[PDB]
Amino acid sequence: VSTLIPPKVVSSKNIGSAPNAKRIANVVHFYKSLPQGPAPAIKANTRLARYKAKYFDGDNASGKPLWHFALGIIAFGYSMEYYFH
């Protein structure tokens, strides 16, 4: 007898599976995606964007800024020692 009409009806496979949710996510995310992100920090300029760039970038974490930062406070109180003495 005469075949039923379901095989030629589709209209809820688009909620029917899980990658639909991911699809509607990644059509927004990827379509308006940039090839590369914006920045790993770069502001501190006054001849100190260089200080941050050399020391406090993702390029390295090394003891050089620590030494520098320590020395600033040492220079304050060391001069003040002779202001107190």
Partner: protein, 56 residues
């Protein structure tokens, strides 16, 4: 041929395998196959309409 109809039918039963929510479409198709097979055996069973009057 009849084999075109039936090949497309059984191929479609196995396509209907690859789609769910169509669990009785194939059962209708099976019925169509049955009666198609029935009409050929109906036709082979046949007693020709005319009486035999040459010999009989």
């Amino acid at each position: 041929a009849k084999s075109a109809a039936n090949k497309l039918d059984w191929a479609k039963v196995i396509s209907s395998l690859r789609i769910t929510g169509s669990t009785a479409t194939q059962l209708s198709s099976f019925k169509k196959r049955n009666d198609e097979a029935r009409r050929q055996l109906l036709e082979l069973q046949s007693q020709p309409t005319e009486v035999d009057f040459s010999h009989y």
